[PDB]
Amino acid sequence: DVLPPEADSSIMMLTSDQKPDVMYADIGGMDIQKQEVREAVELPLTHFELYKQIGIDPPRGVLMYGPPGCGKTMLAKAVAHHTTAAFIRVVGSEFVQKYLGEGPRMVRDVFRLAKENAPAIIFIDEIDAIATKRFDAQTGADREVQRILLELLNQMDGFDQNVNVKVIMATNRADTLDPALLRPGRLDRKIEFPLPDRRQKRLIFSTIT
Amino acid sequence: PKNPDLRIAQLRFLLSLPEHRGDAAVRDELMAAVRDNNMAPYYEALCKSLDWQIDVDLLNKMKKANEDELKRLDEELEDAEKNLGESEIRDAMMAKAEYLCRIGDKEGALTAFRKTYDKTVALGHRLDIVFYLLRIGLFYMDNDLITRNTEKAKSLIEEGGDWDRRNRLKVYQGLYCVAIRDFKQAAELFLDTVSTFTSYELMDYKTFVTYTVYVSMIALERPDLREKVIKGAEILEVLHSLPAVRQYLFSLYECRYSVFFQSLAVVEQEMKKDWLFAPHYRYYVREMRIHAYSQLLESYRSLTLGYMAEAFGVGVEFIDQELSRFIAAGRLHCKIDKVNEIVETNRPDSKNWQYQETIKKGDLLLNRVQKLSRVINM
Amino acid sequence: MSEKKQPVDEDNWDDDNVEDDFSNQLRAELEKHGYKMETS
Amino acid sequence: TPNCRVALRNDSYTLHKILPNKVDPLVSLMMVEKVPDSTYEMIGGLDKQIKEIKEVIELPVKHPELFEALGIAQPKGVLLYGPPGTGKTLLARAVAHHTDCTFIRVSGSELVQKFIGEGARMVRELFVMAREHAPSIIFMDE
Amino acid sequence: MDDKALLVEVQLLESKTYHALSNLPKARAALTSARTTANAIYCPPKLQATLD
Amino acid sequence: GGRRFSEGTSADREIQRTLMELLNQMDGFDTLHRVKMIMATNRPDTLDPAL
Amino acid sequence: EVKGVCTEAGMYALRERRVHVTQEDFEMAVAKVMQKDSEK
Ligand SMILES: Nc1ncnc2c1ncn2[C@@H]1O[C@H](COP(=O)(O)OP(=O)(O)OP(=O)(O)O)[C@@H](O)[C@H]1O
Ligand SMILES: Nc1ncnc2c1ncn2[C@@H]1O[C@H](COP(=O)(O)OP(=O)(O)O)[C@@H](O)[C@H]1O
Ligand SMILES: [Mg+2]
C-alpha cells in the first residue's frame, strides 16, 4: 500500500505557541537586508506571476552569513512570525543519527513535507555542521555525512520552479564550505551581515532604549 | 531574403483582385520582381499579368545570376567540407538557402531548412528557420504547415525567456488570427502594442495600431474599451497623428452616431480595398452596424423609430429594412411595432441563447463521430 | 480499394454565412447614405 | 556485464535476473558539479579566440590525418588566461559541447572522491573513466 | 569636479522647476537623472526623502 | 569549546557538530527562560568567539 | 557585470509592478552595480 506523506519532528511549526514573538520594528537599522530578503523570499511567494511574466528566474535558496550577533537568528524569527505560508524549521546538526539511513530519510521526508504541505519555507541553521571541505572515507562517521550532502544536493535539484519552496540557510563561517553547494541552480543569493557603523547603530540604540 | 517579402504578396493581391487597379502593381511589383534575382514566383503572376515576352532575356540574365549564386554554393560546398568548422556547407546555405527561399521556390528552401535544422544545436538559429517557414507558410498560405511550426516554434521558447522570440511570435499568431475571422483572439494576440516593434512587415507601427484598434472595436466590450484603449498613452500618442481613426474611435465612444457611418463607410471602403481584410470586409461592418444598434438600442425601451433618422443616421426606411433583417436575423434583442411608429425592446435570459450554440456543437460533433464511426470498421 | 461500383454516372463557411445573410443586399452600400442626406 | 545490478533469490542465492544498469559515476559527478552548459549563440565578441580554440581542439578530432599531412604532432595543452568573468568556463564548456566531448573538470574535492575510488592515491585513476569516455576534455580552474 | 551631492540638489531643483513650469517629460528625465545620480552616495540624509 | 578549525583531523568535525549543536541549543528559536548556565575554564584564550 | 546589471533591471520594473522592462531601469541599475564598481 502507498502512504500519505510523513516526516520527523519538524511538523510545520504548529503556529499557535510557535511564533518567536518578534516584530519587524524590533530590528532597527537593517533596511537593505530586510527589504532585500523581503524581495528574496515572500515576494515570489505572493507575486509569483511577475517573476513568471517578466521571467527573471526567482532564486531557489538563499545563504546568509557574517560575524555572530548580527541578526541571523532574529531575522528568521521575524520572517517566521509575519509569514503566511507554512514554515519548516530544523536544527541542522540533527541529521547525524546513530543508525544509518535515518539521516538520508530524515533529509528526504522534510522536503517531501515541504512538497506535499504548502508553498512553504525551509530554514536550516549551522550548515558548517554538514557542509565542510575535507572528507575521510575511513570512519563511517564521515561517510554518513557525505551521504547526507549527496542526498540534500540531489533533492535541491529535484525541483521544477513550479513549487514555491524556499530554503533559508544561516551560518557563521563561509570559508569552511564547499562551493559545489554554492553553484547556481541551488544557491545564488549570498548575504553577508557586516557591522553597523554609526548610522544603523543609533537606530538600534533607539529601539533598545 | 524574407524581410521585405510581404509587400510582394500584398502587391500580388493589388495586382490580381482589384480589376481596374492593375497598373501601378505591375509597375512596382516588376520594379522589385526582376531585381534582387527573383525568378520563380511570378510565372503564373505573369500569366495573370500581361504578355511581357521581352522579359525572356531578363529571365536569362537572372537565371544566369541565379546560376552564379548556385555555382558558388557549389564552390563553397567542398572547402566547406574540407575543413569542418560547423557543417560549413549548411553554414553557407543556412544564410543562402533563404536566398534560395526567396529566389527559388519552397522545395530547395524546405529540404535545406529541414536539412539545416539539425545543424545548430542551440535554437538561436533553429527558431529563425522556423520563423522563415512561418513566413513562407503565410505566403503560400500553407494553413497546415503553419500549425506544425507554430507548435514546434512555441516548444522552443520555454527554455530561455526569449520575449523577442515570443512577442515577435505573437505578431505572427495575431496576423493569423486576423487572417481567419478570429477577432477576439486576434486582439488578444494584439494585446501589448508595447513590446511590438518597428517591423519589417508592418514597417509602420501605426498601421499595426490601426489593425489592433479595428480588431479591438469588435473584439471587446465597453468596460474594456473604457479602460484599455481610452487611457493608454502608448496607444493614444500614435492615433494622435491619426485624424480619422481617432475620430472613428471617438465617434463610437462619444455617441456620435451620424458621422460614425461616414467614417465607417471610409474604413469599410479601404478595408474592401485592403489585402487580408478583403476576405472579411462584409463580415466586419455587418458586425459594426449591429454593434452600434445594440449600443444605442439597449439603453431605452420606448424609443421610436423616427427618432433615429436625424440623431443617428438618415433613412427611416433604411432603419426599417435594416432592423427588420436583424430581428429577422435572430439577433438585436428588441421587438418593433409598425403602424403606431414605436420600437420596443425586451431583455432575454442567458438560457436559450446559450442553449442554442450547445445544440449546434452537439449536432456538429455528433455528425463528426457518426461520420468517423462509419469510416472505421468498414 | 476505393472502387465505387457505379450504377449512375475554414476559409469558406463563415464567409458563406456572410453570403447567407447578406447574399445580394447592399453590395455597394457607400453612396446611399449621401443619397439619404437630402431625402431624409 | 561487470559493474551491473542484478536480481537474486534469497534461499540459495541463485542468480535471478539482470536489472537496470547503474548510473555512471561520471554522470553523477557532473550532476554534482553542475557546470553552466553553453553554446556559440551566447558568446559575446570573442570570435578570434574561437578561431584559435577551433584550431587547437576542433581539428584533431574531425581531421586527425590532417596533421599527418604535415608530419607534426598534435597539440595537447591549452592555457586560457585573462581576468575572471570573461567567458572561460562557458567557452571551454561550449567547445566540448559542439565537438561532442566529455567535459570533465576537476576541483580536487572529496565528495567527488567516492566516485573516483576509495582513496585515489593519484590523480591518474581518473584516466580509467577518461578513456572509458575516450573523446574527452579535462578542465581546470586556477 | 569631485563633488556629487550638489548634483542631487541641482537636478532635484530642475525637477522642481520643470514640473512647476509644466514640462512633464523633461521632469521625468530629470527625476530619473536624480535617481541614477542618487544611486552613488553613501549618505542621502535629507536628500533621500526630498527626492522621495 | 575550542575556537574553530580549518579542518585538520577526522575527530574534531563531529565535535564541532556537538559544539554548534550546543550553541544553537543555547539561544536558537527558544524562550530560554528559567535555565541559567554557569561555565568555567583556566584559559579563555582557546574559545570560539561565537561562544 | 553586464549580466549583473541586466538581470537586476527586472527588479525595478517588478518593484514598481510593471510587466515591461524600461530603459530607465537599466541606467538605474548601472549606477548600482557600477556603484559596486565604486565599492572598494
Ligand atoms: N536590530 C538589531 N540588530 C542587531 N542585533 C540585535 C538587534 N536587536 C537585537 N539584537 C541583539 O542581537 C542578538 C543576536 O541576535 P541573533 O541571535 O539573531 O544574532 P545572530 O547573528 O543569529 O548570532 P548567532 O548566530 O551567534 O546567534 C540578540 O540577542 C539581540 O539581543
Ligand atoms: N564573453 C561573454 N559573453 C557572455 N557572457 C559572459 C562572457 N564572459 C563572461 N560572461 C559571464 O560570465 C560568467 C562565466 O564566467 P567565466 O569567465 O566563464 O568563468 P570564470 O569567471 O571562472 O573565468 C557567465 O555567467 C557569463 O554570463
Ligand atoms: Mg544565530
mmCIF file of C-alpha atoms in Angstrom, chain D residues 6-133:
data_model
loop_
_atom_site.group_PDB
_atom_site.id
_atom_site.type_symbol
_atom_site.label_atom_id
_atom_site.label_comp_id
_atom_site.label_asym_id
_atom_site.label_seq_id
_atom_site.Cartn_x
_atom_site.Cartn_y
_atom_site.Cartn_z
ATOM 1 C CA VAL D 6 21.090 -7.999 -10.712
ATOM 2 C CA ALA D 7 18.178 -9.688 -9.011
ATOM 3 C CA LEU D 8 18.937 -12.501 -6.612
ATOM 4 C CA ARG D 9 16.882 -15.116 -4.832
ATOM 5 C CA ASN D 10 17.488 -15.479 -1.115
ATOM 6 C CA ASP D 11 17.239 -19.156 -0.183
ATOM 7 C CA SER D 12 20.069 -20.470 -2.355
ATOM 8 C CA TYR D 13 21.266 -17.126 -3.819
ATOM 9 C CA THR D 14 20.661 -18.339 -7.346
ATOM 10 C CA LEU D 15 21.031 -15.553 -9.882
ATOM 11 C CA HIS D 16 17.518 -14.479 -10.768
ATOM 12 C CA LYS D 17 17.511 -11.714 -13.363
ATOM 13 C CA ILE D 18 19.522 -8.757 -14.615
ATOM 14 C CA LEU D 19 18.083 -5.403 -13.603
ATOM 15 C CA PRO D 20 18.686 -1.895 -14.989
ATOM 16 C CA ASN D 21 22.234 -0.528 -15.140
ATOM 17 C CA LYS D 22 23.940 1.575 -12.511
ATOM 18 C CA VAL D 23 24.135 5.303 -13.194
ATOM 19 C CA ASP D 24 27.568 6.313 -14.453
ATOM 20 C CA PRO D 25 29.826 7.861 -11.795
ATOM 21 C CA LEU D 26 30.991 10.483 -14.275
ATOM 22 C CA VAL D 27 27.356 11.384 -14.934
ATOM 23 C CA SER D 28 26.756 11.652 -11.191
ATOM 24 C CA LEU D 29 29.987 13.656 -10.967
ATOM 25 C CA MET D 30 28.938 16.294 -13.489
ATOM 26 C CA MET D 31 25.467 16.210 -11.948
ATOM 27 C CA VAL D 32 27.102 17.193 -8.654
ATOM 28 C CA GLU D 33 29.260 19.882 -10.226
ATOM 29 C CA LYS D 34 26.568 21.461 -12.479
ATOM 30 C CA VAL D 35 28.634 23.461 -14.929
ATOM 31 C CA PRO D 36 26.724 26.137 -16.874
ATOM 32 C CA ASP D 37 26.189 24.430 -20.260
ATOM 33 C CA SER D 38 26.759 26.885 -23.109
ATOM 34 C CA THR D 39 26.921 27.354 -26.882
ATOM 35 C CA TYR D 40 28.211 29.634 -29.620
ATOM 36 C CA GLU D 41 24.930 31.566 -29.511
ATOM 37 C CA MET D 42 25.781 33.004 -26.078
ATOM 38 C CA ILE D 43 29.317 34.159 -26.917
ATOM 39 C CA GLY D 44 29.884 37.887 -26.834
ATOM 40 C CA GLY D 45 32.510 39.044 -29.331
ATOM 41 C CA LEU D 46 35.369 36.581 -28.869
ATOM 42 C CA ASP D 47 35.463 35.234 -32.399
ATOM 43 C CA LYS D 48 39.217 35.310 -32.933
ATOM 44 C CA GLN D 49 39.694 33.309 -29.735
ATOM 45 C CA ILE D 50 37.012 30.969 -31.059
ATOM 46 C CA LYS D 51 39.087 30.633 -34.228
ATOM 47 C CA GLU D 52 42.128 29.820 -32.111
ATOM 48 C CA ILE D 53 40.459 27.161 -29.994
ATOM 49 C CA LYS D 54 38.889 25.572 -33.079
ATOM 50 C CA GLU D 55 42.414 25.242 -34.475
ATOM 51 C CA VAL D 56 43.615 23.666 -31.254
ATOM 52 C CA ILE D 57 40.801 21.243 -30.399
ATOM 53 C CA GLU D 58 38.274 21.066 -33.250
ATOM 54 C CA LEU D 59 40.833 19.956 -35.836
ATOM 55 C CA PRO D 60 42.430 16.902 -34.064
ATOM 56 C CA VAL D 61 39.109 15.054 -33.911
ATOM 57 C CA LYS D 62 37.414 15.652 -37.236
ATOM 58 C CA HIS D 63 40.747 15.696 -39.087
ATOM 59 C CA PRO D 64 43.464 13.738 -37.275
ATOM 60 C CA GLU D 65 45.022 12.810 -40.615
ATOM 61 C CA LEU D 66 45.461 16.486 -41.497
ATOM 62 C CA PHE D 67 48.389 16.624 -39.082
ATOM 63 C CA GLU D 68 49.850 13.570 -40.770
ATOM 64 C CA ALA D 69 49.685 15.651 -43.941
ATOM 65 C CA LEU D 70 52.194 17.975 -42.260
ATOM 66 C CA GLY D 71 54.220 15.480 -40.241
ATOM 67 C CA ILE D 72 53.831 17.264 -36.902
ATOM 68 C CA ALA D 73 52.452 16.038 -33.601
ATOM 69 C CA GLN D 74 49.087 17.094 -32.294
ATOM 70 C CA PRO D 75 48.751 19.727 -29.554
ATOM 71 C CA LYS D 76 47.630 18.617 -26.116
ATOM 72 C CA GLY D 77 47.760 21.576 -23.709
ATOM 73 C CA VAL D 78 45.673 24.750 -23.609
ATOM 74 C CA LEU D 79 46.251 27.676 -21.272
ATOM 75 C CA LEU D 80 43.478 30.261 -21.212
ATOM 76 C CA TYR D 81 44.095 33.477 -19.329
ATOM 77 C CA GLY D 82 42.613 36.855 -18.592
ATOM 78 C CA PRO D 83 40.621 38.416 -15.748
ATOM 79 C CA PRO D 84 37.808 36.413 -14.137
ATOM 80 C CA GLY D 85 34.336 36.812 -15.551
ATOM 81 C CA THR D 86 35.488 36.779 -19.182
ATOM 82 C CA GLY D 87 33.934 33.606 -20.566
ATOM 83 C CA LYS D 88 36.465 30.906 -19.681
ATOM 84 C CA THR D 89 34.046 28.361 -18.233
ATOM 85 C CA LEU D 90 31.342 28.820 -20.869
ATOM 86 C CA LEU D 91 33.929 28.760 -23.643
ATOM 87 C CA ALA D 92 35.592 25.529 -22.551
ATOM 88 C CA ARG D 93 32.171 24.012 -21.886
ATOM 89 C CA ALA D 94 30.920 25.219 -25.264
ATOM 90 C CA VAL D 95 33.788 23.743 -27.293
ATOM 91 C CA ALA D 96 33.295 20.246 -25.885
ATOM 92 C CA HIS D 97 29.548 20.727 -26.302
ATOM 93 C CA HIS D 98 29.915 21.384 -30.015
ATOM 94 C CA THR D 99 32.619 18.824 -30.785
ATOM 95 C CA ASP D 100 30.805 16.272 -28.553
ATOM 96 C CA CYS D 101 33.455 15.530 -25.950
ATOM 97 C CA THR D 102 33.063 14.569 -22.297
ATOM 98 C CA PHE D 103 33.608 17.864 -20.474
ATOM 99 C CA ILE D 104 35.195 16.714 -17.218
ATOM 100 C CA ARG D 105 36.515 19.380 -14.911
ATOM 101 C CA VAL D 106 38.444 18.602 -11.761
ATOM 102 C CA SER D 107 38.325 20.507 -8.485
ATOM 103 C CA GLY D 108 40.189 18.335 -6.000
ATOM 104 C CA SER D 109 37.034 17.985 -3.927
ATOM 105 C CA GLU D 110 36.210 14.978 -1.795
ATOM 106 C CA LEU D 111 32.531 14.480 -2.485
ATOM 107 C CA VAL D 112 33.765 13.622 -5.960
ATOM 108 C CA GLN D 113 36.255 11.251 -4.319
ATOM 109 C CA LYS D 114 33.959 8.263 -3.721
ATOM 110 C CA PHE D 115 33.171 8.041 -7.431
ATOM 111 C CA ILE D 116 36.818 8.027 -8.456
ATOM 112 C CA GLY D 117 37.618 5.378 -5.892
ATOM 113 C CA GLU D 118 38.122 4.832 -2.212
ATOM 114 C CA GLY D 119 41.287 6.898 -1.885
ATOM 115 C CA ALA D 120 42.582 7.505 -5.434
ATOM 116 C CA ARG D 121 46.176 7.929 -4.268
ATOM 117 C CA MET D 122 46.978 9.723 -7.545
ATOM 118 C CA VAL D 123 45.021 11.863 -9.942
ATOM 119 C CA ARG D 124 45.841 9.160 -12.511
ATOM 120 C CA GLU D 125 42.884 6.931 -11.567
ATOM 121 C CA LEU D 126 40.654 9.450 -13.363
ATOM 122 C CA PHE D 127 42.116 8.176 -16.645
ATOM 123 C CA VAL D 128 40.118 4.947 -16.454
ATOM 124 C CA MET D 129 36.878 6.890 -16.741
ATOM 125 C CA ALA D 130 38.572 9.271 -19.181
ATOM 126 C CA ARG D 131 39.491 6.584 -21.700
ATOM 127 C CA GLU D 132 36.168 4.965 -20.884
ATOM 128 C CA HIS D 133 34.746 8.183 -22.310
#
